[PDB]
Amino acid sequence: GSGHACYRNCWREGNDEETCKERC
C-alpha cells in the first residue's frame, strides 16, 4: 500500500534507505 509506494518512489529517485524509511 501507500507506505510501500512511498518507499519505492523515494528509493527510485535516488534517496538512501535510512532517508526513505524515515520518510515513509
From Swiss-Prot:
Q: Does the keyword Secreted apply?
A: yes
| Maturation and modification | The two disulfide isomers globular (C1-C3, C2-C4) and beads (C1-C2, C3-C4) do not show activity on Kv10.1/KCNH1/EAG1.
Superkingdom in the source lineage: Eukaryota
Cystine pairs: C6-C24, C10-C20
The primary site where this protein sits is secreted
Spell out the coiled coil positions from the record. Answer: none
- Tissue specificity field: Expressed by the venom gland.
Modified positions (Cysteine amide) are: C24
Q: Which GO terms describe its molecular function?
A: potassium channel regulator activity; toxin activity
BP GO terms, sorted: defense response to fungus; killing of cells of another organism
Q: Which InterPro entries match?
A: Toxin_25
Q: List locations, semicolon-separated.
A: Secreted
GO annotation, cellular component aspect: extracellular region
Q: Which family does it belong to?
A: Belongs to the short scorpion toxin superfamily. Potassium channel inhibitor kappa-KTx family. Kappa-KTx 1 subfamily.
Instruction: List the protein's name.
Output: Potassium channel toxin kappa-KTx 1.2
Species the sequence originates in: Chersonesometrus fulvipes
